[PDB]
Design an enzyme around this catalytic site. Structure first.
Site, short mmCIF file in Angstrom:
data_model
loop_
_atom_site.label_atom_id
_atom_site.label_comp_id
_atom_site.label_asym_id
_atom_site.label_seq_id
_atom_site.Cartn_x
_atom_site.Cartn_y
_atom_site.Cartn_z
N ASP A 71 -6.16 6.29 -5.09
CA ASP A 71 -5.66 4.91 -5.15
C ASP A 71 -5.67 4.39 -6.59
O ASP A 71 -5.91 5.15 -7.53
CB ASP A 71 -6.44 4.00 -4.19
N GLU A 115 0.80 -1.23 0.00
CA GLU A 115 0.00 0.00 0.00
C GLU A 115 0.83 1.28 0.00
O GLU A 115 0.33 2.34 -0.40
CB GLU A 115 -0.98 0.02 1.18
#
Ligand code: IBF
Length: 162
Positions: free
Chosen positions: A20, A11
């Site tokens: 994202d 991440e």
């Protein structure tokens, strides 16, 4: 290696609001804020999560706090789901981390499509499960991460994460 280090690799860490892989406002260690295209809505979700007026920026400590909560929530979600709990319980600790990783990324909405993969995982048909997991939007959209997670399921080792 463990679930925290694993998700930290997958991440990253960013202290300002970013989009994202799916284009959704996110902060910290892949903490999804909202699927709304409104930055203001995202800033509101952030303030709510942190408990102060952040203006879209948080500290490393705050990012890590949300991350711990998110990992905890992912595992708790698995255990509360009737279709997920038995597969999870059937796994060793390394493969359990791989399960948490997927839940973290896609949620139970995204995990719903993986019924056939889950069955092969519970059967411990690791190579077949690995092949099945790759036949997915998930693999196609995030292949490098999916390859790491799949290798973890295939081998029950941390080889893909060094
Ligand atoms: F319980 C489980 C999940 F919720 C999951 F997403 C995956 I991938 C798993 F492999 C699993 F065992």
């Amino acid at each position: 290696m463990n679930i925290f280090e694993m998700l930290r690799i997958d991440e990253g860490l960013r202290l300002k609001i970013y989009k994202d892989t799916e284009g959704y406002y996110t902060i910290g260690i892949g903490h999804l804020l909202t699927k709304s295209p409104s930055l203001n809505a995202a800033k509101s979700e952030l303030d709510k999560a942190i408990g102060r007026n952040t203006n879209g920026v948080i500290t490393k400590d705050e990012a890590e706090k949300l991350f711990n909560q998110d990992v905890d929530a992912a595992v708790r979600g698995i255990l509360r789901n009737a279709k997920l709990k038995p597969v999870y319980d059937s796994l060793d600790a390394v493969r359990r981390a791989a399960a948490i990783n997927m839940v973290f990324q896609m949620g139970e909405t995204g995990v719903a499509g993986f019924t056939n993969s889950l069955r092969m995982l519970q059967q411990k048909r690791w190579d077949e499960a690995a092949v099945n997991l790759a036949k997915s939007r998930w693999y196609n959209q995030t292949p490098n991460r999916a390859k790491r997670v799949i290798t973890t399921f295939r081998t029950g080792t941390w080889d893909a994460y060094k």
